[PDB]
Amino acid sequence: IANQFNSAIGKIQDSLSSTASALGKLQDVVNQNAQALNTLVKQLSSNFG
Amino acid sequence: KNKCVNFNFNGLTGTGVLTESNKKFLPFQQFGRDIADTTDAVRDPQTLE
């Protein structure tokens, strides 16, 4: 049971070292807030007539 | 330069601090614009810098 836990934690390190998209839920929050601040800046370019 | 002023370059009035830029304007350009569609660099009309 100890060797299985130690081996299963080894796969957490290997996974987080290997695959880029693991934290997709958190990066998508940072992306949404940054996209909103960038859209709000670009809207200063609008003439509105 | 390096002080806050009410500038006016060729009718481009604004409030800002002027600074010596490394932005390489090609000969035909006089104003450079930011993502917000506002001027963030200008060629001085007496000293061509």
Which residue of chain B comes nearest to A45, CA vs CA? B37
Contacts of A38 in chain B (CB under 8 A): 35
B41 contact partners, CB below 8 Å, separation of at least 6: B21, B23, B25, B31, B32
What is the experimental method?
A: cryo-EM
SS3 track for chain A: CHHHHHHHHHHHHHHHHHCCCCCHHHHHHHHHHHHHHHHHHHHHHCCCC
Q: Is B38 on the interface with A (CB under 8 A)?
A: yes
Residue B36, min C-alpha distance to chain A (Å): 5
Burial class (CB in 10 A: 0-12, 13-18, 19+), B42: buried
B49 contact partners, CB below 8 Å, separation of at least 6: B20, B21, B43
A45 contact partners, CB below 8 Å, separation of at least 6: B36, B37
- The backbone torsions φ and ψ at residue B12, rounded to the nearest 5 degrees and listed phi first, read -75, 80
